[PDB]
Design a protein around this ligand. Sequence first.
Ligand SMILES: Cc1cc(Nc2ncc(C)c(N3CC(O)(C4CC4)C3)n2)sn1
Ligand SMILES: Cc1cc(Nc2ncc(C)c(N3CC(O)(C4CC4)C3)n2)sn1
Lengths: 279, 283
Amino acid sequence: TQFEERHLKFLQQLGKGNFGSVEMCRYDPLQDNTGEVVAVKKLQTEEHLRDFEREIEILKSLQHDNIVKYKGVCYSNLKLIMEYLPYGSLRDYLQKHKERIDHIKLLQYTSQICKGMEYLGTKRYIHRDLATRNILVENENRVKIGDFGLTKVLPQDKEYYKVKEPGESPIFWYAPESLTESKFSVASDVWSFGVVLYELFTYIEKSKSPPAEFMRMIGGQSIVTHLIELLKNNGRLPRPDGCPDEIYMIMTECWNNNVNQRPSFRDLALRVDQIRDNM
Amino acid sequence: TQFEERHLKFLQQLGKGNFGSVEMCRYDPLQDNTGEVVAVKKLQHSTEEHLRDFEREIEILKSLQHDNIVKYKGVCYSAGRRNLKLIMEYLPYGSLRDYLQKHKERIDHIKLLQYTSQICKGMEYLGTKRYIHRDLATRNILVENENRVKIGDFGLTKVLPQDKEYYKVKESPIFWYAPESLTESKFSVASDVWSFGVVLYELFTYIEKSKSPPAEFMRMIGQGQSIVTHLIELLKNNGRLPRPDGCPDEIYMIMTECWNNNVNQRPSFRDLALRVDQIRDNM
Ligand SMILES: Cc1cc(Nc2ncc(C)c(N3CC(O)(C4CC4)C3)n2)sn1
Ligand SMILES: Cc1cc(Nc2ncc(C)c(N3CC(O)(C4CC4)C3)n2)sn1
């Protein structure tokens, strides 16, 4: 399905980053306000352009209930057209609607994230950026992974990917081996999933955020250096208040220093599903 | 048991109020560091009027015999029967407020509901004596062990008149008070139930200071009038504390029913016990 620029009508900025923006647009070839609302990602380097071309093809290759839908591309620079999900990021949804979201609902979302991550796994894709800000809410009962800007394809013969990036990284979501050796794997995605579970069960309360807690535990060396040393000494995020024992246990296993001792996404889905039924 | 002052050995201050102090002492008649540790309540700078209230507080506690009520052990007079002290069992884990702040990472919703159940049973028992607590707050509940809490102070507790279901009191914990307590100083079993709703709120927020009843009410209040005036008006307009993060639906519903403006629409402590117990089993 082709998208002409001339019919792409700017409605609102959804987000602006470094090197990228996302906009709500109406695709309106009949110019009567009837056309479909879509999300449009675009660049705001040759290196960022390369990453974006690869990001488009990664998303185009994904078809899953819990992955934001690829719709197409729009050229003049390149724009990536996606389905618009009206409730926005899980991060913002949960801050807004937390008084109406119980533990059962959190475990529903958790399950769906695990299924999307399991599917990424089958393509040998490493997300690298698993955070509630990168998950989207389609409705009360469905979330989707909604950004693939850092996603890498494993080499054919290796279980990890080493990255040379000099930009800001979401370090308070990163596995120790990601921080020390820039090694990214399914196991570093599982570490990051543990931090997502933490975000959900703290209800995105600012005073309990991963950066708040890590900086409190840290107190002339970079924050990265202090964080590696703290994780090496088995410093961890604390149990969220009222977090069920089996959910805290899942988080602590995700945060094993040893990549090879972290759970599989298939196992996580099963264990989350069982906690949810048990409740 | 009579307790002689000469054998009561001060170990540590447990707490200090406007008119009172509580101390950990060893009762050591054998003066070999072997005697039993007890909690001792005394008046700070006694009036005759505070002394009268304290004598009534003593008789209230002496009349209570219940697994979830701190044990009365006896009284201690200074020389010449000048100064009354109330001797209680010492509960080593202290206030629920402090225990939960300390040990929250090891206390799940099941445990909170066990404590909640036990508070309801103590309150049901108070009810049968026609006693109104007036001060139901996690700072006034004590932790004997991981599986047992007790109501642990009766310093504001009143006996109902013979012919009425409320007592009218001629600083107060206003952020735990029922609207009719704030406007008319009317205290009843229903105003105790309102306060219990706030205890449930305290427990399910895990005593987090940014979510405390005073923090939330003051945020809702934002003013050329007393805080009490702003609070009455807020509660009249159905302002309420918000649902604690991850509070089960049926526990938030219990909280909201305890905070009905109409005294006659608030649940009974017998019903609250049943409902809390059932949520706990269902979990
Ligand atoms: C209120 C609201 C609605 C939004 N919808 C929407 N729909 C699709 C996408 C791809 C999208 N994005 C990508 C985004 O940068 C972050 C998830 C990664 C926001 N947002 S956003 N806010
Ligand atoms: C660490 C610790 C242990 C405590 N134990 C204890 N044992 C009995 C009583 C009566 C008591 N009190 C009365 C108190 O003023 C408030 C609850 C009403 C503390 N404390 S206290 N702290």
